[PDB]
Design a protein around this ligand. Structure first.
Ligand SMILES: C[C@H]1CCCN1C(=O)c1nc(C(=O)NCC(C)(C)O)sc1-c1ccc(C(O)(C(F)(F)F)C(F)(F)F)c(Cl)c1Cl
Length: 228
């Protein structure tokens, strides 16, 4: 497990991320001043829940598609048996979606890029899950503090997915080995770039876990009311 191997692992993970990032950070950053007007916000607030759910189901499934492709390009993932790939994605893909979202979050005015412009949490009231929406915003705000580089997001989201503790893995040893090498790669890269200090600012588990569980509960309610 050589220095050159760890360097190439950082490079491949970063490349996999660039190939599947959905939106370019430069585009997201240049759009920050493009904010929904008061009239456009009212427009969204007046939409039915049904309509907002159809819209947001589309955005969710699109985001998940990119995360699945990221995993499949990730060095070492395709070595796992199909069962274990499925276990890791079922457990981790939404978590990656939520982490990726901080790139599209502007902490200065607490807005997120959505359907072409930046809007705050009040844009989403018609969905009828106020707690969840503000939990998403709060999670994004907490990640915003780290000012992740694109390479750090790549490595961190790889580790969100490659977690040997997920229940139901058939080849736990295999996943442990992959995780061990990605952790070494992450920390090697942080020290190389003088960015170790972001580790102490990564958030407490209970936030995201609650978040993904909250999402799961609300998704089931939407599917009941309006199966897609
Ligand atoms: C912004 C989030 C919260 C408000 C609406 N929304 C999206 O539509 C959305 N967008 C995503 C994305 O990656 N887009 C890329 C970019 C950020 C650049 O715009 S991903 C996603 C998303 C959709 C639904 C849920 C639900 O849990 C909900 F709505 F309840 F919160 C579910 F409907 F599934 F139940 C959840 Cl959490 C999420 Cl994160």
């Amino acid at each position: 497990a050589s220095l050159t191997e760890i360097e190439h692992l950082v490079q491949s993970v970063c490349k996999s991320y660039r190939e599947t990032c959905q939106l370019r950070l430069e585009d997201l950053l240049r759009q920050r001043s493009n904010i929904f007007s008061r009239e456009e916000v009212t427009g969204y607030q007046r939409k039915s829940m049904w309509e907002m759910w159809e819209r947001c189901a589309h955005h969710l499934t699109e985001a998940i598609q990119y995360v699945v492709e990221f995993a499949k390009r990730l060095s070492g993932f395709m070595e796992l048996c199909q069962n274990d790939q499925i276990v890791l994605l079922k457990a981790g893909a939404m978590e990656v979606v939520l982490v990726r979202m901080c790139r599209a979050y502007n902490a200065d005015n607490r807005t997120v890029f959505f359907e072409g412009k930046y809007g705050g949490m009040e844009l989403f009231r018609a969905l009828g899950c106020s707690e969840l929406i503000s939990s998403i915003f709060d999670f994004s705000h907490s990640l915003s503090a780290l000012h992740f580089s694109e390479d750090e997001i790549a490595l961190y989201t790889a580790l969100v997915l490659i977690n040997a503790h997920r229940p139901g893995l058939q080849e736990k040893r295999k996943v442990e080995q992959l995780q061990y090498n990605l952790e070494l790669a992450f920390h090697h890269h942080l020290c190389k770039t003088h960015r170790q200090s972001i580790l102490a600012k990564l958030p407490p588990k209970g936030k995201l876990r609650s978040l993904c569980s909250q999402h799961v509960e609300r998704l089931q309610i939407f599917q009941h009311l309006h199966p897609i």
